Amino acid sequence: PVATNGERFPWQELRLPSVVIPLHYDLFVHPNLTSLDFVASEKIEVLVSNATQFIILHSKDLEITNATLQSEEYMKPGKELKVLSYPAHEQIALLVPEKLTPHLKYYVAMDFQAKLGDGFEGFYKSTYRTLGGETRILAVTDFEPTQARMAFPCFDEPLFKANFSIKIRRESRHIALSNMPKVKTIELEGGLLEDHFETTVKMSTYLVAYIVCDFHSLSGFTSSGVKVSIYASPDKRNQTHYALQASLKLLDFYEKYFDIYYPLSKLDLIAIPDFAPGAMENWGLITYRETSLLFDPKTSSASDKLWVTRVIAHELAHQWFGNLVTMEWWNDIWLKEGFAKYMELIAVNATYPELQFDDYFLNVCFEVITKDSLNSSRPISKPAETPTQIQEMFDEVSYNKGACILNMLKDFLGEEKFQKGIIQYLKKFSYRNAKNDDLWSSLSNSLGENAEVKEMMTTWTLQKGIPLLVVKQDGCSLRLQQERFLQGVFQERYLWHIPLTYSTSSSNVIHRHILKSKTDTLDLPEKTSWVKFNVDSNGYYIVHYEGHGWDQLITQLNQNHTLLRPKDRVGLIHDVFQLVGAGRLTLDKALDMTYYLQHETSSPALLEGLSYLESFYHMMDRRNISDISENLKRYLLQYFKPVIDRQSWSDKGSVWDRMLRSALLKLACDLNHAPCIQKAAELFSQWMESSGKLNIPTDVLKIVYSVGAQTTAGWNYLLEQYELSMSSAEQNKILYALSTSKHQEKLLKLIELGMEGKVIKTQNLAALLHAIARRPKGQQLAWDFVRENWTHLLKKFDLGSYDIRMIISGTTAHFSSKDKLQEVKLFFESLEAQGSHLDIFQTVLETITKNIKWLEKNLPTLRTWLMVNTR
């Protein structure tokens, strides 16, 4: 069953056969950054197991021109092979003239060439702007999951590990980096230089990497002698300082924490200009977006600092979770991505406790629950096959839900027993691969009535959705049922092994009960006012207090809120508003709970609460529901006047202090509070008049620019300043500010530039569209554009890239009318070209219907509740 030139093709599965295992790759690459193409050769030391007529391996968009097979027994230098190509599985078959012999080592050699990548995949070209306005080319790799094969032919599944010796030829004006450090640089006849790189460790193909560029570094050494260097564009070297400092502290932490040294002499962190993902964990050569790594204190803010620290810690943790211990197959991608996200917490809490990152980790878990509460959610670990359905595994479920469900398990086993379990996991499967079950046996065993942790996690990993815990308190006995939590019912299948954590009014001691059933009972050792299940919200479930249970907790908040823990509070605020969407509580209960927030000073809770009230304002503003929006404006500005007026247009104070400032000054300026608009307007006007000279504090930088962008003069100068900027973070904030214009031609212009890709890089287009679509003046525009340019979009990105998923989601999911639901339905059916299908078509439809339902069921309550206040 087969093509191309002619005949049958030996192997039919899209997975490779087990029979021939690579041990080592010699790989020579000769890129040309004027021609924008490359020539290359490799030699794959392979080991046969079963006898065979055909070697099979991956290759894509590669012209193969010579293919020889040598041996050491057998047939010494050396015989030629025939190449069959089968693009539909991205495979090529090497036909041999002789049934190869078991247990012997051969050498597969091919010459191959291709144009440098045109997109964000395989070995591609990126560009950057010099301070002088020069444009400069570099070449870079991104192979995850399956684009190693676009750069050199190989056994491109992450189970087929091997050693890699890379050689790279280059002009004198460039450097070459790769996974390993550079052993030597030999000069050649014609003036060109060639760099030789230490042979790698055993590793998967998706992590192999190499770059050619004219970047400058800053370097440092960890206590363990590792040479960390931070590579970036030449005129951006000042911005590499924080990343160096942090990575140093972080690698020290990770080394000790895991009790496993980082194996390589060096670890490079490079800031690539055209970079689709946030970062990529390429062993010893970690590639990052400039916003994931660079930092300029004149222009990056607290949040940016927190983000850069977070991604650095994420990618450094990958060096152990992923690279050192790789998953067997892409179905279990979370073992890498989830653990890496979890370790951000542990590592950043340890190295940078001033950042208060653990309060922010709750945020990330809650934002998961929001998407995980629909029918069309999926498990963190489900099977995967085709080139599309592997790319579908890359999102936030396999990632954040992963990290939260791990964070739960830390709490249930304690930091010390959890740590010891992953130390053994890492050591037991070092330089090797591991399944889901291999992790659980490692965490249970660390005699003997059993931790049977497998059973507990089978239900959190391989099963969809999230539990709701309902509790009734009749005097001194507690009723406990569990249900699947959905966002529209009145579920017939599911059941979790959910550890529980309750506290009471009587004492603040944490008692623990587990559970492995639909129903259960537990009596408390006291009569008491309230119970609060899920302490600090370290579990990944939602609590509903049926009977008077909710009302007690709200009267507790209004009386003396500090008798609940500050994380206990954010949990309750969250849960209440979600249960309104569930139809288990009524909106007035939720809105009444927001009264205490004029006394709340824990910014976690205060920001959470405000986010719901701001969320409602924006729902109302996008629909033209003026009477409610104008009331909700007025409520937010009068209630919360004290805390708004207490805010300095400054960079002063803690991290949460600075984030609260940015939030509240944004809210005030988004709701047209004349004092905040006039201050912002002054700061911008002084700035533009001085021509970049004055300094807007970084925490009000978005606010000042966005207000400034309402005048035509300001918008045009901001777009100009965008192109000249040397901070990708300032640029980010400028792009937001530009996308808050009311002028339709201006919003379109931004989209057109983002298509064009020269001034506003294409990597920013999805976020840009979503920025526009969020607002009432651009929600239609953005929608029209995405439909009318679907073909035009799908040249620039493949579906289902993260980029395409966020273009669909970001232009549609905020809709909340029956009309627009139909428009989206229509458009989604229309895409039964190859288009249909993606999982995100369903989840958008369910998201829009959720908004339809929420409005019909709760809007008149929101209207009256606001009118009750005004009296």
Ligand SMILES: *[C@@H]1O[C@H](CO)[C@@H](O[C@@H]2O[C@H](CO)[C@@H](O[C@H]3O[C@H](CO)[C@@H](O)[C@H](O)[C@@H]3O)[C@H](O)[C@H]2NC(C)=O)[C@H](O)[C@H]1NC(C)=O
């Ligand atoms: C990728 O392709 C480039 C051309 O597109 C090539 O640049 C060229 O390099 C040669 C020397 O290496 C220059 O020619 C020189 O040599 C001849 C004698 O053989 C002399 O007649 C000339 O005076 C000169 O000394 C070309 O001038 C040069 N082209 C330019 C404009 O720079 C790159 O070297 C290739 N890159 C790699 C790394 O493969």
Ligand SMILES: *[C@@H]1O[C@H](CO)[C@@H](O[C@@H]2O[C@H](CO)[C@@H](O)[C@H](O)[C@H]2NC(C)=O)[C@H](O)[C@H]1NC(C)=O
């Ligand atoms: C491929 O990588 C492996 C490690 O994954 C290398 O094996 C190391 O070899 C040295 C010298 O024999 C030993 O001291 C180490 O114990 C090995 N590493 C570990 C930690 O197991 C091997 O050198 C590489 N192979 C090639 C072809 O160079």
Ligand SMILES: *[C@@H]1O[C@H](CO)[C@@H](O)[C@H](O)[C@H]1NC(C)=O
């Ligand atoms: C190779 O050998 C073993 C027998 O030892 C067999 O089980 C395995 O299937 C063989 N590989 C194939 C697919 O021919």
Ligand SMILES: *[C@@H]1O[C@H](CO)[C@@H](O)[C@H](O)[C@H]1NC(C)=O
């Ligand atoms: C394949 O191309 C190489 C280029 O290095 C050449 O030396 C060789 O002669 C070619 N193969 C054969 C069998 O001629």
Ligand SMILES: *[C@@H]1O[C@H](CO)[C@@H](O)[C@H](O)[C@H]1NC(C)=O
């Ligand atoms: C950063 O500033 C220092 C001193 O002010 C200067 O020497 C250097 O050129 C600057 N670096 C960059 C990349 O702008």
Ligand SMILES: *[C@@H]1O[C@H](CO)[C@@H](O)[C@H](O)[C@H]1NC(C)=O
């Ligand atoms: C946060 O960090 C400190 C150590 O710096 C520790 O006392 C505390 O237990 C940590 N919490 C978590 C979630 O690890």
Ligand SMILES: *[C@@H]1O[C@H](CO)[C@@H](O)[C@H](O)[C@H]1NC(C)=O
């Ligand atoms: C959830 O919703 C619809 C209708 O109830 C159902 O057909 C669908 O299969 C469910 N979601 C998925 C993708 O399982």
Ligand SMILES: *[C@@H]1O[C@H](CO)[C@@H](O)[C@H](O)[C@H]1NC(C)=O
């Ligand atoms: C709230 O309760 C705390 C703890 O007893 C107490 O210190 C404080 O004075 C109380 N304040 C109010 C507002 O009742």
Ligand SMILES: *[C@@H]1O[C@H](CO)[C@@H](O)[C@H](O)[C@H]1NC(C)=O
């Ligand atoms: C939307 O806003 C416009 C401008 O204020 C207003 O004229 C119109 O009444 C609103 N649309 C509807 C149908 O309410």
